[PDB]
Structure 1
């Protein structure tokens, strides 16, 4: 009963399958948090495994560019994952409002995202669901940190060992190897980083179609291009890093470590 005794609930911030995210206050400390509230009434034993996996993965990850878990609280009928409150909103909304980022801003942005991904990979975590909605700005004040969030689809992997871990992720950001239903691992996250960097620089995605089957064909074939006029003034070094992230063959796809050494990131 630690949550009911110590915290008060306020407005909804998001929704999930069996869950809700809400601002809460730890009343005596006067400190605000975001709580994922899961209804655990007649949860499947598998769904219990998934809940404990998310909590365990979230406890592992200590990084400036990852949302911190503060507590995991089991009450009768409800479980609470208490995270930092981040008030800057989704990266998604910032990109739509500004339309696109300058190369210097996009680079600073993707640099933080890759550092968070590098940490995940070093700790044996694959997110599987990177996209602008899952990346949150630490404040509304321009220059605010990006924080990786929503490890609900994250998996634990043993070093570089890959398997068919299941079909999970978001259509626009899915890797060819996930869509083919082939074994995969850490590189699925670098593929999604490629999609996000593309969006950062021109404010629309490299893969989109009204027909989902045609969308998946385009992705599996790495069928993206750099149309005029929006790409007319973008450097080849930016195109190059995107190319290396959007490499179909996952062995030859740039790693988070390699991407952070790419001149377009490191030589500024």
Structure 2
């Protein structure tokens, strides 16, 4: 506050009013804001500039400008990236349905029909972004948002492409929770687009069984399992799950990424086709 500081807060404070805090997201705090002129509401992520991975701010702006030009119904739309001396402000579509993990906590397990509806949308988004050589790396249920509270609303993947630009919060809200979804080759420091197929496979495993494939009491124990890549469908929870579902998951959780299916192949898989409309 104060005239000088408000002036130096730059174009974001001029253009937008903060209505309320919405919660801590990866990389930064998310707030609901309003465009002062139009009164339309948006979500804004406020990211400390100390959290930039790239020391050249112009590269961050370029990256985000490329992401603004993209358009797919299962990818969050971005409208603006603004700055002041301390922070980046990324403004985009506001959602009100909460995240996919909230929905996992609520429902516990999803029928094959319901899981296929959700995961097909994830696959569609991933396929689209991969066609533009964008990798998520951090795909997890917390980065899959429900557009609204309406029944069967569209899901929206958030933060897709921002991991090249920003490092995680110093204080993260659920660090152990991130280990479940990370691809083994990402842990090794050598990733390409296939890591998003792995993460989506972990999500699908959880939707169907209610349990993670790589588990443990702490981050270390979970990551030790991920690193070996060994998992099973031995739980009674898998007893009556279709062979087709298990086949898709096996292909997605293939250890070597060169041998792992593509996102496009996931969409074509018989299990997804069984539940698609026409």
* TM-score class normalised by the smaller sequence: 0.7 to 0.9
What is aligned with 2:169?
none
More off after superposition, 135-144 vs 228-237: 228-237
- 2: distance between equivalents of 1:42 and 1:238? 39
The answer to whether structure 1 residue 102 and structure 2 residue 123 are counterparts is: no
In the TM superposition, what are the counterparts of 1:80-229 in structure 2 within 5 Å? 80-151=89-160, 153-155=162-164, 170-181=178-189, 183-229=190-236
- 1: distance between equivalents of 2:182 and 2:28? 24
User: What is the CA distance between 1:69 and its match in structure 2?
Assistant: 0.4
- 2: distance between equivalents of 1:14 and 1:50? 27
What is aligned with 1:63?
72
1:37 to 43, 46, 57: 46
What is aligned with 2:36?
27
Mapped contact 1:60–1:123 kept (Cα < 8 A): no
Mapped contact 2:134–2:160 kept (Cα < 8 A): no
What is aligned with 1:235?
242
Distance 1:29-1:267 versus aligned 2 partners, 3 A rule: same
- For the aligned residue pairs, the C-alpha RMSD in angstroms reads 2.5
TM-score (norm 2): 0.83
User: What is the CA distance between 1:59 and its match in structure 2?
Assistant: 1.6
Deviation per residue, 1:157-205 (Å, 9 max, x gap): xxxxxxxxxxxx9311111212234x32010000001000011112221
What is aligned with 1:249?
256
> Any gaps of 5 or more consecutive residues in structure 1?
157-168
- 2: distance between equivalents of 1:154 and 1:61? 17
Greater fraction helix: 2
> Any gaps of 5 or more consecutive residues in structure 2?
1-9, 166-176
Aligned residues: 255
Distance 1:85-1:251 versus aligned 2 partners, 3 A rule: same
Distance 1:124-1:113 versus aligned 2 partners, 3 A rule: same
User: What is the CA distance between 1:127 and its match in structure 2?
Assistant: 0.5
Secondary structure of the corresponding residue to residue 13 of structure 1: strand
Mapped contact 1:40–1:79 kept (Cα < 8 A): yes
